[PDB]
Amino acid sequence: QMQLMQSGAEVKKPGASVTVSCKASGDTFSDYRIHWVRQAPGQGLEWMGRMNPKSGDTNFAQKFQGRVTMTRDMSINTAYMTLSGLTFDDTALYYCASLLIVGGFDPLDDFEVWGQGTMVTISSASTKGPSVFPLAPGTAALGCLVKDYFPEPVTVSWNSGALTSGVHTFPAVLQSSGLYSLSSVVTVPSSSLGTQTYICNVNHKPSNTKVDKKVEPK
Amino acid sequence: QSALTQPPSASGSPGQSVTISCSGTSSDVGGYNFVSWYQHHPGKAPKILIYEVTKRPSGVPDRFSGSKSGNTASLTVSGLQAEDEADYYCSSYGGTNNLLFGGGTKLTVLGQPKAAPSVTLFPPSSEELQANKATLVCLISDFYPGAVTVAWKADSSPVKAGVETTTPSKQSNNKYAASSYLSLTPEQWKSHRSYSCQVTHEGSTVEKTVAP
Amino acid sequence: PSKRSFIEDLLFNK
Hints:
The structure holds three protein chains of three kinds.
Chain A: E1 3-6, E2 10-12, E3 18-25, E4 34-39, E5 45-51, E6 58-60, E7 68-73, E8 78-83, E9 92-98, E10 113-114, E11 118-122, E12 131-135, E13 139-149, E14 155-158, E15 167-169, E16 173-174, E17 180-189, E18 199-204, E19 209-214
Parallel strand pairs in A: 2-11
Antiparallel strand pairs in A: 1-3, 3-8, 4-5, 4-9, 5-6, 7-8, 9-10, 9-11, 12-13, 13-17, 14-18, 15-17, 16-17, 18-19
Chain B: E1 9-12, E2 18-23, E3 35-40, E4 47-50, E5 64-69, E6 72-77, E7 86-94, E8 98-101, E9 105-109, E10 118-122, H1 126-130, E11 134-143, E12 149-154, E13 157-159, E14 163-165, E15 169-170, E16 176-184, H2 186-191, E17 195-201, E18 204-210
Parallel strand pairs in B: 1-9
Antiparallel strand pairs in B: 2-6, 3-4, 3-7, 5-6, 7-8, 7-9, 10-11, 11-16, 12-13, 12-17, 14-16, 15-16, 17-18
Chain C: H1 4-11
Organism (chain C): Severe acute respiratory syndrome coronavirus 2 (2019-nCoV)
Protein name (chain C): Spike protein S2
């Protein structure tokens, strides 16, 4: 069925503009309508507006009218939202979605499709990639420390996603310096420490930081 | 800035029912039959449970039901299960060509057992010490209810400088996680016999210790 | 009958 894939996380200065993209695949793009819904930290869901991909017609929430546009490139099945005049209140997770408000004459197509969300942070601060440190170990816990990055978010996988059992990636701490750090730990059989390679894959899109760190026993 | 009014929280016991409300005006909830209800787990896209006041999309069990009278819509969740803990948002067409949302009601399912924290403590890595830095990493998971306090010790002496601890966060299994970091110089790390992270929860404590 | 997108267009008409 049709899926929506959004662009990666961004950081922008106060007053600037940000564009989030939303690429449709799996069905006719023009059959759907693209809504944008955000959630700022500590706030609830907030609808921003909607776009008809065929015509480009839009409706925007009164709250954003004057500093938002919603556009599309039909040739690449992609929708865009550009939000301008950014303030701290615009730091949020932004979703595109085909919403279900009024149903069809029959209900077979009465379903929603949501993108994965794009994190946008409004800050005057510089982006910086993390330093990734291996945390060496019946079962043994091994990990990696993702130190000093801005802004959120960072993703972590293990063995390129082949290792999922026993993985726990923790929410980041916000240090006094203003930078973030997080850790991810995986619990594995101790007997495998001398025979299995373990690698944490860390990605910080804003800083073009992608590191695969081998975690060896000491 | 939520246009519709929802109480911030609700609770119920397993197998029982809970009803949560969403109030609007005659120009939205009371003017149209385009009320939806969304289930939102942290970190995941909202999942619509009800649309057009009463209708369920495919795969939503009949224990979720919606209704409306006047300017008030209601969602009733029967046969409550732990997986139903989430923040529930109502929405309505309204205003002028707008979709309005309520502020969300966070649902707690009562009766969940006490759970002591699991604690993992890592010392500074060789690589970090070479960079002239040192961080102790105390990772705390699987506790319930969602509150802990963390104490750090150098040998047996309390240390508070350089500590930074997260707020508790809900895990997918209904329990909570947190982490605590102790920043030290390499000299401080090498100078002491050991360092400890002590996690207290409901009056009981779990302690881990690491050494150079 | 038309697809549901067109019904939503009417709901949001200008």
